[PDB]
């Protein structure tokens, strides 16, 4: 059984493009790969195909990393190809060829093949049972043609597979593993309960605070280079709770002596007290020389009772979704995440014994983006009371004109400074700040820098995530209603407020909001966080 090696060349409309495709074949087996793979210069993931000519078993192999190979196999692929014959004949490289035509996804592919050598093969899977394919033409434009056919001693692919372990998978899993090999996933939580129960307690991996409403762990983040992108993904459903709850995925900056973790582990008294003239006290909401507030990776709101209530609440024409996905790009927080062991947590404020179930992961993608260029991150304030069920007061501070005011010191000039600002308004009645628009005003060094009214009018779009939403006499459901910058079942986007360039030295940032008046025991309040972003330039000698 003589073995042959066929080398191919790609063209577009006469223009020769390359990493040449190679087929190695004899009457028993054929191997399809390319130059870079043959030479062990191909980047992961890469694929090879092999056909067992005794039984037409087609095997696809994916090389995922230096050690891991997956394969998927199928002995029906060749039989399913449908070709139409033509009378066209000719020669390629001295071999007699016939042309046949096939159609895949509206693309037309002409295949020219020889049977002169009593072996089969080709530059792709198409036509592999017809003969040895020496030329393919895709939509009359894209051509792959053999440039040489040579005899060789044997089909020997032992070095290709040497040192690697191979595992057969189903076709869907095979593709999935190739996909996941292209980027880094950092697992955090998988099907974790977030609830309210006196029985809730920490274990050796997950710490739990707020009577079950806060789950926290330490996770190691690799070095992530400037240019890479970073996303956080959370999946949620109700395990009993009917309500639209405030949620956060957060990290805890520990660069100063005190952190939000001090509050969580010791108690709310360990947090610095903030006061602004309104007669009340607030805890851990502002940076001080000894303390940084936590950073919100993603602020989200649960829908009303998704999953748990789906079969319980039947409304004609409403087929409820099973769970809620939330995914946010957090590329700008790279400087706070890169190469650190971080404390990362999830909060859903609720009072339900069944509560909620979530999953959470981070992903890091090998990009070289040039759009988000900050190398500096400083958390300046966070009024969101993640410790709601652990003694932290609601953010009712905005009835004073002083609002939230923070002083901080920059040691180096900051170019393109921005305030990453997440705001939501609360107070759940018709004249409460959940439902009435209020202008948020941001000041830098005592001067107004930006004023805007946070408002969402798209909430009716997410109706099918919200089975337990209350239905009113006017024909609307609670989840439909326009709100101060959130909708049940969705993320609240940060805004990126341009502050210009900042000099080294002392600065102040201030937020003022005309907070609505209470109604009986009901209060309005504002969950606001601010992270300062910017680009510090570098000092450097001159060289070429």
Query: Applying CB under 5 A, which residues contact Zn ion?
Result: 50, 157
Sign of CA dihedral 178, 179, 185, 189: negative
Give the span between the Cα atoms of 253 and 270, in whole angstroms: 16
Sign of CA dihedral 366, 369, 375, 377: negative
Rounded distance between C-alpha atoms, residue 120 and residue 104, angstroms: 21
**Shortest separation between residue 30's beta carbon and Zn ion, angstroms:** 9
- Closer CB to Zn ion, 157 or 536, in the complex: 157
Q: Among 483, 474, 387, which Cα is nearest to 428's?
A: 483
What minimum distance in Å lies between the beta carbon of 166 and Zn ion? 11
Number of H helices, E strands in the chain: 6, 33
Shortest CB 318 distance to Zn ion, Å: 54
Task: Please say which residue, 3 or 324, places its beta carbon nearer to Zn ion.
Answer: 3
Q: Which of 251, 258, 266 is nearest to 341 (CA)?
A: 251
Q: Which 8-state DSSP code applies to residue 222? A: P
Choice between 50 and 296, CB closer to Zn ion: 50
The residue assigned the tokens 């709101």 is 301
Closest approach of Zn ion to the CB of residue 37, in Å: 13
**Residue closer to Zn ion (CB basis): 157 or 367:** 157
Residue whose CB is less far from Zn ion, 32 or 387: 32
H/E stretch holding 175 reads: helix 171-180
Name the residue nearer to Zn ion (CB basis): 30 or 328: 30
For residue 177, is the peptide bond before it cis, meaning its omega torsion is within 30 degrees of 0? no
Coil/strand/helix, residue 35? helix
Q: Residue 468's closest CA among 315, 248, 348? A: 315
Nearest distance in Å: CB 282, Zn ion: 47
Which residue's Cβ lies closest to Zn ion? 157
Quick one: 1 or 273, whose CB is closer to Zn ion? 1
Tokens found for residue 190: 């998988």
Q: Which is nearer to Zn ion, 316 or 541 (CB)?
A: 541
Q: Are 494 and 384 in contact (CB under 8 A)?
A: no
Q: How far is the CB of 543 from Zn ion (least distance, A)?
A: 5
What minimum distance in Å lies between the beta carbon of 68 and Zn ion?
Answer: 18
List 500's β-bridge partners, or say none.
417
Report CA Rg, the chain: 31
Smallest gap from residue 390 Cβ to Zn ion (A): 49
Nearer to Zn ion, 220 or 538 (CB): 538
Strand order in the sheet with 246-251: 207-209, 214-220, 341-348, 246-251, 295-301, 491-492
What's 261-273 look like in SS3?
A: HHHHHHCHHHCCE
Q: Smallest distance from the beta carbon of 165 to Zn ion, in angstroms?
A: 15
Cα 433 from Cα 525, distance rounded (Å): 7
Question: How far apart are the C-alpha atoms of 258 and 94, rounded to whole Å?
Answer: 80
Residue (72 or 136) nearer to Zn ion, CB: 72
The minimum distance between CB 49 and Zn ion, in angstroms, equals 10
If the CB atoms of residues 50 and 248 are measured against Zn ion, the closer one turns out to be 50
Compute the CA torsion angle 304, 310, 312, 318 (nearest 10 deg): 90
In angstroms, give the least distance from the CB of 116 to Zn ion: 24
The whole-angstrom separation of Cα 260 and Cα 246 is 18
């Amino acid at each position: 059984a003589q073995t042959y090696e066929i080398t191919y060349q790609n063209s577009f409309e006469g223009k020769i493009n390359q990493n040449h495709i190679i087929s190695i074949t004899n009457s028993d087996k054929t191997l399809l790969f390319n130059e870079k793979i043959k030479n062990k210069k191909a980047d992961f993931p890469f694929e090879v195909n092999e056909i067992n000519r005794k039984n037409n078993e087609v095997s696809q192999f994916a090389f995922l990393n230096n050690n891991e190979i997956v394969k998927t196999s199928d002995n029906t692929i060749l039989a399913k190809q449908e070709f139409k014959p033509t009378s066209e004949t000719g020669k390629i490289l001295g071999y007699n060829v016939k042309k046949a035509v096939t159609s895949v996804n509206s693309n037309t592919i002409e295949v020219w093949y020889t049977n002169d050598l009593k072996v089969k093969g080709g530059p792709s899977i198409l036509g592999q049972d017809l003969g040895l394919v020496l030329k393919t033409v895709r939509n009359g434009s894209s051509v792959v043609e053999a440039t040489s056919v040579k005899k060789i001693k044997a089909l020997d692919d032992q070095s290709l597979f040497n040192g690697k372990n191979i595992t057969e998978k189903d076709a869907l899993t095979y593709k999935d593993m190739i996909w996941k090999s292209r980027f880094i996933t950092i697992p955090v939580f998988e099907n974790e309960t977030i609830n309210f129960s006196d029985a809730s307690k920490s274990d050796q991996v997950i710490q739990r605070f707020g009577n079950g409403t806060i789950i926290l762990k330490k996770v190691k983040i690799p070095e992530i280079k400037q240019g890479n992108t970073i996303f956080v993904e959370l999946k949620q459903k109700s395990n009993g709770d009917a309500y639209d709850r405030t949620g956060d995925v957060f990290i805890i900056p520990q660069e100063r002596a005190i952190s939000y973790y001090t509050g969580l582990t010791q108690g709310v008294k360990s947090l610095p007290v903030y006061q602004n003239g309104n007669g009340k006290s607030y805890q851990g909401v502002a940076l001080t020389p000894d303390y940084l507030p936590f950073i919100e990776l993603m602020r989200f709101f649960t829908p009303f009772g998704i999953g748990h209530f789906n079969e319980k609440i039947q409304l004609k024409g409403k087929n409820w979704h099973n769970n809620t996905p939330y995914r946010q790009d957090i590329t700008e927080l790279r400087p706070q995440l890169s190469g650190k062991e971080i404390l990362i947590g999830a909060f859903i404020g609720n009072y339900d014994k069944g509560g909620h179930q979530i999953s959470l992961e981070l992903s890091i993608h090998p990009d070289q983006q040039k759009i988000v260029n900050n190398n500096f991150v400083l958390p300046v304030f966070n009024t969101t009371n993640v410790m709601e069920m652990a003694g932290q007061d609601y953010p009712t501070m905005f009835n004073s004109d002083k609002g939230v005011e923070v002083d901080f010191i920059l040691t180096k000039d900051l170019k393109n400074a921005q305030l990453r600002y997440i705001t939501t308004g609360h107070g759940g009645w018709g004249a409460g700040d959940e439902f009435v628009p209020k202008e948020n005003s941001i000041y830098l060094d005592g001067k107004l820098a930006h004023a805007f009214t946070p408002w969402r009018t798209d909430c009716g779009s997410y109706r099918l995530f919200n089975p337990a939403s209350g239905n009113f006499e006017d024909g609307l459901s609670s989840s439909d209603l326009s709100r101060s910058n959130w909708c049940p079942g969705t993320i609240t986007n940060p805004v990126y407020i341009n502050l210009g360039n900042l000099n080294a030295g002392k600065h102040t940032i201030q937020v003022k909001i005309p907070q609505g008046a209470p109604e009986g025991s009901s209060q309005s309040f504002w969950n606001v966080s601010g992270v300062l972003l910017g680009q510090e330039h570098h000092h450097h000698h001159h060289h070429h």
